[PDB]
């Protein structure tokens, strides 16, 4: 059947983007500015060891089990006059969570065992640089159910509810625990788990609550 491809890039200069564009024109590949459920490939700017910075496209590419590949894939494919294999250029890590964690590969191979399967997540209060609905999409892609209001968690013993907050975007986030029994964690719990494609322990991300 058909090859299926639709590409975005992340962290590229306009000159580097124009090489992607030339590569996409040569091989007849769709290239868009925004990531969507159609996207198959995220082309990250990396160093020579395939380490990138963490952008929203990085997180969403990993979350969707997409090909998250170095820009070197493009440059080397131009030089070789053919589309090279993605496995040879896959992003290995990032400047926050580790240079060789292999989160992208882990996610691509783990879509039948998603990191937040069995969790219900409320993305609560203000976020910066990342609209609430994009954080909600990210966690859904990773197998969580999303709730919009605390009240609508529910229900018995095995849950498990989790409230995610970005304190520095905000007082109020210290009094959530007096209302519901769910652990309250920083947004870094989500981002770190997604980049590593490994559900992190809550402990270091818990936001101390007023008794």
């Amino acid at each position: 059947v058909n090859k299926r491809m639709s590409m975005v890039v992340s962290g590229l200069t306009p000159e580097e983007f124009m090489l992607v564009y030339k590569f996409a024109r040569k091989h007849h590949i769709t290239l868009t500015n925004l990531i969507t459920e159609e996207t198959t490939h995220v082309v990250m700017k990396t160093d020579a060891e395939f380490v990138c910075e963490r952008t929203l496209k990085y997180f969403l590419g990993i979350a969707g089990g997409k090909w998250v590949v170095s820009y070197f894939w493009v440059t080397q494919s131009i030089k070789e006059r053919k589309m090279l294999n993605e496995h040879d250029f896959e992003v290995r890590g990032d400047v926050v969570n580790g240079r060789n964690h292999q989160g992208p590969k882990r996610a691509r191979e783990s879509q039948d065992r998603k990191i937040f399967r069995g969790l219900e997540i409320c993305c609560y209060g203000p976020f910066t640089n990342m609209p609430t609905d994009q954080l909600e999409w990210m966690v859904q892609l990773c197998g969580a159910s999303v709730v919009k209001e605390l009240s609508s968690f529910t229900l018995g013993t095995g849950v498990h509810p989790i409230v995610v907050v970005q304190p520095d975007a905000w007082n109020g986030f210290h009094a959530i625990g007096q209302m519901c029994e769910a652990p309250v964690v920083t947004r870094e719990w989500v981002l770190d788990s997604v980049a590593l494609y490994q559900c992190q322990e809550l402990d270091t991300y818990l936001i101390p609550q007023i008794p």
Binding site: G11, E53, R54, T55, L56, K57, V96, N129, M130
Partner: peptide, 7 residues
């Protein structure tokens, strides 16, 4: 414009 980074 410029994509935000998450340090």
């Amino acid at each position: 414009a410029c994509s935000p980074q998450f340090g």
